[PDB]
Every structure is written in C-alpha cells, then in structure tokens.
Amino acid sequence: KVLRDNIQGITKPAIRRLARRGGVKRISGLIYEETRGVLKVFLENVIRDAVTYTEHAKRKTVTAMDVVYALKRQGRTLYGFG
C-alpha cells in the first residue's frame, strides 16, 4: 500500500475556505499549489521529528504527544492533548 499525490487531495475550495477564515477577499490561482508546497514543507518537519520521538519511543504507532513535543521544540506548542 504505497501512497502518493494526496497533496492535491487538498481542494482549492478548502484552501479558499481557510483563506476566508484568515479574512482574505481576492486570491490568485498560483497560490494554491504553492500553498500546498509550504503545507508539505511545514509538515515535512514535524512528522519526521514526531516519528523521531516515536523512533526513540521504539513503537510502531505514532501518538499525539509526539507532535506536542515537536511543536514545543518547533516553538508552536499546542494544548488539549495531555
């Protein structure tokens, strides 16, 4: 089960929904994929670092506390998950 191309699984309607939440009126097309890239790049770090935790955790499943400590180490800490 080898996955691929779920990045475009991000719908442009979803992107513009997030933008409207951010309070944006007019948007260009060139953004979305660009956006996506950033998205990827962003998560590009955390999961790895997260599984890095799981790396040292010696476990096969990945937990929330992983990304908790990541965002912490990434200076983007989050609440509500222990």
Partner: protein
Amino acid sequence: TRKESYAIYVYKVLKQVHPDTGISSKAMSIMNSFVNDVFERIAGEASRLAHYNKRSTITSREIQTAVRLLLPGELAKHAVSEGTKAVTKYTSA
C-alpha cells in the same frame, strides 16, 4: 493505571470564580496541558537561574524572579502578591 490531573482543582477554582459557569472536558484537558506547560516553563527557568547562581537548592525567591521574567508586567506583580500571601499564610502555619 492511575493518571493524575487537575480537573478537580480547575473545577474547584472555576466554582470559586464562577459557581454557575460549566466546563467542557476538551477545554478541561486544554487547561491541564496549559498549566503543565507553564509549570515546566517556570521550572526550567528557575533551574537555569539557580544553575547560574550555581545553587543546588531552588527556593521561592528564584520563583518570584523567574515568574517576573515570565509574566508580562502587571500580571507578575499581581501574581507575586498572592504568592507572597501564600508563603506568608504558610510561614504563619
């Protein structure tokens, strides 16, 4: 497996401030995580300072200093007062 928390304490202080207002478990665990984070903040900061003082003991003066470092202005002021109150109330034990 016993998992400690502070939902009891957060609910206590909730009632102490708002006996009427309720609470959600999601926001409850949010509160818990948050207080854990800020407690680790103050712990690391005070330990760092004491290490700078090279003092193997961690006392309340360290706590006051480091929370002053942590809190934006007036909060700390307010904060330290009650803290002092606390230790006074506890030193007067």
